Amino acid sequence: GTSVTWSETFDGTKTDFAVKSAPTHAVSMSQATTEMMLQLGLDDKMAGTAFKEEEIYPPLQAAYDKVKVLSDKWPSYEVFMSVKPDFATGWPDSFSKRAIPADKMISQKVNIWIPESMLSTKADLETNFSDMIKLGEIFGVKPKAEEWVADQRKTLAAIQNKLKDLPRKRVFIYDSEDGQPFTAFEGYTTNILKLIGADNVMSGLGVDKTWAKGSWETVIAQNPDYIIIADYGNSIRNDDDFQQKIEKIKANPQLQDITAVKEGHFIRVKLSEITPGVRTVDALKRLAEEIHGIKV
Ligand code: NA
Ligand code: NA
Known part of the structure; x- marks a missing residue:
């Protein structure tokens, strides 16, 4: 009944996020978060992955094959938006000006979550x-x-x-x-x-x-x-x-x-x-x- 809540900060701007139900169009911008999501069995909730760096961890290859690959690196904002994302995760640089700035995603109601370990x-x-x-x-x-x-x-x-x-x-x-x-x-x-x-x-x-x-x-x-x-x-x-x-x-x-x-x-x-x-x-x-x- 309660929300799952968290915060992220991008360019000094802190945003509060919440969900009451699992995201259904999640995009992973990094291989590490892609593997984390696949390990939890989340391929059905994933609208895209990006920036594969090396061979996918072998137990997760078959699940990986079920998810759309948006780009071999980071996708353009247009390609990103084309899959109607509602959640995005990845290394912090994925949400910088080198890729797709977080504020643009947040404008479009995308929830962004980044592992604390990163x-x-x-x-x-x-x-x-x-x-x-x-x-x-x-x-x-x-x-x-x-x-x-x-x-x-x-x-x-x-x-x-x-x-x-x-x-x-x-x-x-x-x-x-x-x-x-x-x-x-x-x-x-x-x-x-x-x-x-x-x-x-x-x-x-x-x-x-x-x-x-x-x-x-x-x-x-x-x-x-x-x-x-x-x-x-x-x-x-x-x-x-x-x-x-x-x-x-x-x-x-x-x-x-x-x-x-x-x-x-x-x-x-x-x-x-x-x-x-x-x-x-x-x-x-x-x-x-x-x-x-x-x-x-
Ligand atoms: Na919070
Ligand atoms: Na490194």
């Missing part, structure tokens, strides 16, 4: 769980979301039980480089890796950002045990991007005495696995096995 450097795995619950509440499927969170917690506990009394490891996340490495500092990626005893060496350095350029000097000083490398390839059956980045690191004389480099501790991830979405605990299972040598 809003600040405070975000952690619990924030992602809460976001899934909230998304569930908005769409009248709270029990489905609670069932998913419950399963994630059970699996996470199984991983952590295997890790009890194993030494923690220091890690460096290598997204890419352009002279300097681009890496993760604070927020979601750092916080979820801490759950499996993997401590981001770029965290705790006073840089309040999710991602930014770092200095190799800093990485060398921190001497990580493992280097986790984001693979930006098309197929999971192809780790060419991963291997090229390994070779780029190996070929850099400045990095040759870093522990991870000497020991060949290179670990492959997709960005979708270490940023908010539905893949986190599944990815943490694999990473825990690779970093700590356990089987869970």
Whole structure:
């Protein structure tokens, strides 16, 4: 009988939103929110998706195939409006002037919701769980979301039980480089890796950002045990991007005495696995096995 309510702020303008029934023409502007919605079984309520970045999480591919793709990137306002949307979600940039400004959508009575896990450097795995619950509440499927969170917690506990009394490891996340490495500092990626005893060496350095350029000097000083490398390839059956980045690191004389480099501790991830979405605990299972040598 009560409304599900929330607020968002765009360009200093705060808007209050409410729904009393599930949206029926929802548009997802980002792959991460697309996966969140598909995980909750919401394809029938979806009028469109946008900006696919990598292969859809395989359990969700068949549901993904049921939803109209509006654009390979972000759709124009006209294409967006053409599906009569009533709800939109995505990363914050989806609602900026680089895409479709939120105020234009709000003019047309579209409700906009953004996962809290995507809003600040405070975000952690619990924030992602809460976001899934909230998304569930908005769409009248709270029990489905609670069932998913419950399963994630059970699996996470199984991983952590295997890790009890194993030494923690220091890690460096290598997204890419352009002279300097681009890496993760604070927020979601750092916080979820801490759950499996993997401590981001770029965290705790006073840089309040999710991602930014770092200095190799800093990485060398921190001497990580493992280097986790984001693979930006098309197929999971192809780790060419991963291997090229390994070779780029190996070929850099400045990095040759870093522990991870000497020991060949290179670990492959997709960005979708270490940023908010539905893949986190599944990815943490694999990473825990690779970093700590356990089987869970
Ligand atoms: Na509110
Ligand atoms: Na990023």
